[PDB]
Amino acid sequence: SDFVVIKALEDGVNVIGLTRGADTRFHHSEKLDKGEVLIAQFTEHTSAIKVRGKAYIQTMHGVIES
Amino acid sequence: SDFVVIKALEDGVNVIGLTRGADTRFHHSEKLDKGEVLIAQFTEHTSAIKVRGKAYIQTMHGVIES
Amino acid sequence: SDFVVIKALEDGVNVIGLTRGADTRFHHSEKLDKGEVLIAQFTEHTSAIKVRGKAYIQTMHGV
Amino acid sequence: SDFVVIKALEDGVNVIGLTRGADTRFHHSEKLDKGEVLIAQFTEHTSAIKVRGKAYIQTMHGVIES
Amino acid sequence: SDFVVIKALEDGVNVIGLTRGADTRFHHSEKLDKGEVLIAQFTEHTSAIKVRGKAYIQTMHGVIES
Amino acid sequence: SDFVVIKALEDGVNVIGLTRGADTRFHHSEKLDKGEVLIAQFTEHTSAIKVRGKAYIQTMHGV
Amino acid sequence: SDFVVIKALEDGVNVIGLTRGADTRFHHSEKLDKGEVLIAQFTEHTSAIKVRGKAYIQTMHGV
Amino acid sequence: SDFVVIKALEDGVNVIGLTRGADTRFHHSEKLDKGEVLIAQFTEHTSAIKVRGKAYIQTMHGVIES
Amino acid sequence: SDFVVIKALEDGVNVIGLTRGADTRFHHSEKLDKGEVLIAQFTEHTSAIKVRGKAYIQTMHGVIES
Amino acid sequence: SDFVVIKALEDGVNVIGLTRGADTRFHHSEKLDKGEVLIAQFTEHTSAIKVRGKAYIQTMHGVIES
Amino acid sequence: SDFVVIKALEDGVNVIGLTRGADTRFHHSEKLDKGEVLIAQFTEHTSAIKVRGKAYIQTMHGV
Amino acid sequence: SDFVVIKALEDGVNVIGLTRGADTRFHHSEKLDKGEVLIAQFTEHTSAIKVRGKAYIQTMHGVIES
Numbered sequence: 028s029d030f031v032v033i034k035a036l037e038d039g040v041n042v043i044g045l046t047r048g049a050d051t052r053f054h055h056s057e058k059l060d061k062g063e064v065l066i067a068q069f070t071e072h073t074s075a076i077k078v079r080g081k082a083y084i085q086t087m088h089g090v091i092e093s
Numbered sequence: 094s095d096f097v098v099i100k101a102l103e104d105g106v107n108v109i110g111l112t113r114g115a116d117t118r119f120h121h122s123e124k125l126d127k128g129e130v131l132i133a134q135f136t137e138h139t140s141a142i143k144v145r146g147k148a149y150i151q152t153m154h155g156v157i158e159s
Numbered sequence: 160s161d162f163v164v165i166k167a168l169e170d171g172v173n174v175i176g177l178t179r180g181a182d183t184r185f186h187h188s189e190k191l192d193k194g195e196v197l198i199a200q201f202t203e204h205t206s207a208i209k210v211r212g213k214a215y216i217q218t219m220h221g222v
Numbered sequence: 223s224d225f226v227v228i229k230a231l232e233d234g235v236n237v238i239g240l241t242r243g244a245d246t247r248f249h250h251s252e253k254l255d256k257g258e259v260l261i262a263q264f265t266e267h268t269s270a271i272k273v274r275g276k277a278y279i280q281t282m283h284g285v286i287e288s
Numbered sequence: 289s290d291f292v293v294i295k296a297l298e299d300g301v302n303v304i305g306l307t308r309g310a311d312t313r314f315h316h317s318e319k320l321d322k323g324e325v326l327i328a329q330f331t332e333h334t335s336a337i338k339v340r341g342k343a344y345i346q347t348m349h350g351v352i353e354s
Numbered sequence: 355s356d357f358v359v360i361k362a363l364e365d366g367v368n369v370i371g372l373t374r375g376a377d378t379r380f381h382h383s384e385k386l387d388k389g390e391v392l393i394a395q396f397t398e399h400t401s402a403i404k405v406r407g408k409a410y411i412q413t414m415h416g417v
Numbered sequence: 418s419d420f421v422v423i424k425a426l427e428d429g430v431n432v433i434g435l436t437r438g439a440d441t442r443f444h445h446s447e448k449l450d451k452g453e454v455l456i457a458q459f460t461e462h463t464s465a466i467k468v469r470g471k472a473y474i475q476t477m478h479g480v
Numbered sequence: 481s482d483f484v485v486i487k488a489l490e491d492g493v494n495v496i497g498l499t500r501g502a503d504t505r506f507h508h509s510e511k512l513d514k515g516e517v518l519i520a521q522f523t524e525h526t527s528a529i530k531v532r533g534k535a536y537i538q539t540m541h542g543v544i545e546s
Numbered sequence: 547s548d549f550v551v552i553k554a555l556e557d558g559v560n561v562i563g564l565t566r567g568a569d570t571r572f573h574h575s576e577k578l579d580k581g582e583v584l585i586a587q588f589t590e591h592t593s594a595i596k597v598r599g600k601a602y603i604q605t606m607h608g609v610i611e612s
Numbered sequence: 613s614d615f616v617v618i619k620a621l622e623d624g625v626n627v628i629g630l631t632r633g634a635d636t637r638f639h640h641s642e643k644l645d646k647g648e649v650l651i652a653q654f655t656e657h658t659s660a661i662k663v664r665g666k667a668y669i670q671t672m673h674g675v676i677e678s
Numbered sequence: 679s680d681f682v683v684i685k686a687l688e689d690g691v692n693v694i695g696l697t698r699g700a701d702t703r704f705h706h707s708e709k710l711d712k713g714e715v716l717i718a719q720f721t722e723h724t725s726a727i728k729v730r731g732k733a734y735i736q737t738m739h740g741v
Numbered sequence: 742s743d744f745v746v747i748k749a750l751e752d753g754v755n756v757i758g759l760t761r762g763a764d765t766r767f768h769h770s771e772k773l774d775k776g777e778v779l780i781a782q783f784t785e786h787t788s789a790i791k792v793r794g795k796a797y798i799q800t801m802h803g804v805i806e807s
């Protein structure tokens with residue numbers, strides 16, 4: 028099962044889960060302060076993930092650092 | 094399931110999901126402002142993804158940037 | 160399932176999906192303007208994809 | 223599921239699908255003008271593919287350029 | 289399913305499918321003129337493929353040319 | 355199933371498990387003191403893990 | 418299923434299929450003339466293949 | 481199933497199993513004195529493992545030592 | 547399904563199939579003259595193969611040449 | 613199915629199996645004298661293995677020599 | 679299923695199979711004389727193998 | 742299924758199959774004279790193979806010769 032690693036590079040980063048299904052809305056926003064890490068899966072309820080703010084992101088595809 | 098990473102390189106990038114099935118229409122357009130990232134799977138409802146605007150994109154096949 | 164990445168290098172690139180089944184016709188053509196990207200899977204309804212117009216294209220086999 | 227990429231290197235290339243089953247006949251011919259690309263799967267209805275005209279062809283086995 | 293790529297290097301190459309099952313006979317012969325290509329799977333009906341004429345052939349095992 | 359290796363590099367590192375399902379809340383926070391290690395899986399109940407505090411972290415994607 | 422690639426380097430190469438089962442006999446011999454190619458699978462009916470005559474042969478193990 | 485190797489580098493190292501399920505508590509603490517090794521799987525009952533004390537640890541992800 | 551390639555390096559090579567089951571006896575011996583090749587599978591009826599005479603043998607493990 | 617190789621580097625090494633299930637206790641201790649080797653699987657009854665004494669240990673993760 | 683290759687480098691090497699299950703005892707010890715080889719699988723009845731005596735041993739993890 | 746290649750390097754090599762199950766006895770001994778080869782699988786009836794005599798042996802793990 029696929030997952031995303033997000034490390035915040037500043038205060039106030041948001042990681043937002045978008046709902047799986049015919050409809051798409053934000054179901055949760057997790058706040059990260061500078062240096063906090065979130066390792067989040069794709070799930071039965073989450074089929075897309077949006078990241079706002081300067082962040083280091085790893086997935087199976089590789090890395091993107093803000 | 095396969096997924097795409099999109100990093101917006103300018104304001105107002107749109108990531109659009111196209112419906113799976115006999116019919117094809119846009120079901121959702123997620124706006125991304127500069128530096129924001131979307132990690133989005135293909136799903137039961139989305140079998141094609143369209144990106145408009147300056148974006149850095151990674152898939153299983155590699156990177157596509159501009 | 161397998162997918163193709165198409166980036167339009169001109170305006171009006173057509174990504175044309177062809178029907179899975181005994182019959183072969185286009186059921187959808189998605190237009191891409193210069194610099195726009197489509198990542199499109201093979202699916203229950205699409206078993207062949209045609210690209211008309213100048214495009215950078217990636218598949219599992221390469222670019 | 224296996225697939226073939228065909229890029230036409232001249233006008234009037236034909237990509238022809240041959241029927242799956244005990245009988246073999248052409249069920250469809252798709253025309254490609256110079257520079258047009260066809261990415262076609264093997265399917266429930268297509269077990270062989272014939273290409274006529276100068277074409278660049280990729281499969282899992284590698285490349286043949288006319 | 290496994291497949292074979294055949295590129296005809298002269299006019300009048302024949303790609304022949306041999307029947308799967310207790311009995312073995314030719315069920316189809318596809319003629320290829322010079323530069324024409326056939327990508328052909330093994331199937332429920334075809335368990336051996338015969339090539340006659342000058343051909344460049346790729347399989348999973350490699351290339352065989354002349 | 356997939357797992358994460360967290361080594362605390364300060365006292366009071368919190369490894370926070372978030373609920374699998376429609377709702378997202380923390381159901382458990384495991385505290386790690388400096389030098390202590392937690393190897394934690396994704397499971398039926400945990401679909402996201404947050405680490406608060408300075409930590410060396412390994413996943414399938416790298417450190 | 419596994420297959421063998423035989424290219425005849427003389428006239429009258431015989432590719433001989435032997436019966437899968439308790440009994441072992443040839444059920445088919447396919448003749449190849451010089452330069453002709455047979456790509457032949459193992460199947461429900463063929464569990465051993467014999468090549469008589471000079472031939473270039475590829476399998477999963479090499480040439 | 482995935483497993484962890486722990487080698488104690490001092491007396492009194494504890495390897496603790498945390499319960500799988502909605503609830504999370506310690507169910508067992510195995511003490512390791514210097515040079516002693518535990519190879520421990522994740523299981524139906526254990527979905528997280530905690531190490532306290534100076535240890536050399538190997539997992540699928542690599543080594544972690546001190 | 548596993549298989550053995552045998553090429554005879556002299557006249558009179560024998561490739562012998564030993565029966566699968568509680569009992570073990572030779573069920574067939576195939577003769578190979580110099581330069582003849584046998585590609586033989588392990589099967590429902592054959593769980594061991596004996597080769598007598600100077601032969602070049604390939605399996606998944608590699609090569610043995612007499 | 614995963615397994616551990618233990619070679620004793622002194623007399624009196626013990627390899628101890630810990631029970632699978634909600635409860636954890638030692639179910640068996642196998643003694644190894646210097647140079648004796650134990651190759652032990654994880655099983656329906658054993659989910660953790662403890663080694664006491666100077667030992668060379670290999671698992672899928674690599675080697676630890678006392 | 680997984681297997682071990684034992685080559686005896688002295689006379690009287692014992693390859694000892696231990697019972698799969700709740701109980702652990704030896705159910706079989708196969709003696710090897712110098713230079714003799716045993717290739718032995720893990721099975722429904724054997725979940726641990728002990729080698730007593732000087733031996734060259736290969737597993738999936740190496741020698 | 743896994744298999745072993747044995748090449749006899751002297752007359753009178755024996756390849757012995759040991760029974761699978763709760764009981765262990767020899768069920769078959771195949772004699773190999775010099776240069777003769779046996780390729781033998783593990784099976785429903787054979788879960789250990791013993792070689793006596795000078796032999797070159799290949800398995801999935803590598804080669805063992807003398």
Ligand SMILES: N[C@@H](Cc1c[nH]c2ccccc12)C(=O)O
Pocket residue numbers: 045046047048049050051052074075108109110111121122123133134135136137138139142
């Ligand atoms: N509700 C959408 C979410 C989604 C996933 N991938 C997307 C790509 C573009 C737009 C929306 C999405 C779905 O499950 O299909």
Ligand SMILES: N[C@@H](Cc1c[nH]c2ccccc12)C(=O)O
Pocket residue numbers: 111112113114115116117118140141174175176177187188189199200201202203204205208
């Ligand atoms: N509704 C279409 C969407 C699609 C996927 N790939 C395509 C390629 C071309 C055109 C449309 C598509 C389908 O599910 O099949």
Ligand SMILES: N[C@@H](Cc1c[nH]c2ccccc12)C(=O)O
Pocket residue numbers: 177178179180181182183184206207237238239240250251252262263264265266267268271
């Ligand atoms: N309707 C055809 C479409 C197709 C796929 N691959 C092809 C190759 C050639 C011609 C047509 C096709 C089918 O599903 O089989």
Ligand SMILES: N[C@@H](Cc1c[nH]c2ccccc12)C(=O)O
Pocket residue numbers: 240241242243244245246247269270303304305306316317318328329330331332333334337
């Ligand atoms: N109708 C044939 C088509 C075919 C596939 N591979 C071939 C090779 C040779 C000749 C015909 C074929 C079949 O399904 O079997």
Ligand SMILES: N[C@@H](Cc1c[nH]c2ccccc12)C(=O)O
Pocket residue numbers: 369370371372382383384394395396397398399400403498499500501502503504505527528
């Ligand atoms: N009881 C929790 C244990 C757990 C696993 N990974 C975690 C990460 C953080 C907190 C707790 C956990 C569960 O099975 O899901």
Ligand SMILES: N[C@@H](Cc1c[nH]c2ccccc12)C(=O)O
Pocket residue numbers: 042043044045055056057067068069070071072073076372373374375376377378379401402
């Ligand atoms: N309850 C959410 C937790 C979650 C997983 N990945 C996420 C990414 C973003 C936001 C929330 C999450 C879920 O199971 O889907």
Ligand SMILES: N[C@@H](Cc1c[nH]c2ccccc12)C(=O)O
Pocket residue numbers: 306307308309310311312313335336432433434435445446447457458459460461462463466
């Ligand atoms: N009718 C034969 C065709 C065949 C496949 N491989 C062969 C090798 C030799 C001779 C015939 C064959 C079968 O299906 O088994």
Ligand SMILES: N[C@@H](Cc1c[nH]c2ccccc12)C(=O)O
Pocket residue numbers: 435436437438439440441442464465561562563564574575576586587588589590591592595
């Ligand atoms: N009828 C035999 C054919 C065979 C396959 N491999 C062999 C090796 C040796 C001798 C005969 C064979 C069988 O199906 O088992």
Ligand SMILES: N[C@@H](Cc1c[nH]c2ccccc12)C(=O)O
Pocket residue numbers: 564565566567568569570571593594756757758759769770771781782783784785786787790
């Ligand atoms: N009848 C035996 C044949 C066999 C396979 N591997 C062996 C190794 C040694 C001796 C005999 C065998 C069986 O099916 O098990």
Ligand SMILES: N[C@@H](Cc1c[nH]c2ccccc12)C(=O)O
Pocket residue numbers: 495496497498508509510520521522523524525526529630631632633634635636637659660
């Ligand atoms: N009875 C425990 C044994 C165990 C496995 N891994 C562990 C890690 C730590 C403590 C105990 C264990 C179980 O089956 O889950």
Ligand SMILES: N[C@@H](Cc1c[nH]c2ccccc12)C(=O)O
Pocket residue numbers: 693694695696706707708718719720721722723724727759760761762763764765766788789
């Ligand atoms: N009858 C034993 C044979 C065996 C396999 N591996 C062993 C190792 C040691 C002793 C005996 C064995 C069993 O099937 O389990």
Ligand SMILES: N[C@@H](Cc1c[nH]c2ccccc12)C(=O)O
Pocket residue numbers: 627628629630640641642652653654655656657658661696697698699700701702703725726
């Ligand atoms: N009867 C034990 C044998 C065993 C396997 N691995 C072990 C490790 C240590 C001690 C005993 C064992 C079991 O099946 O589980």
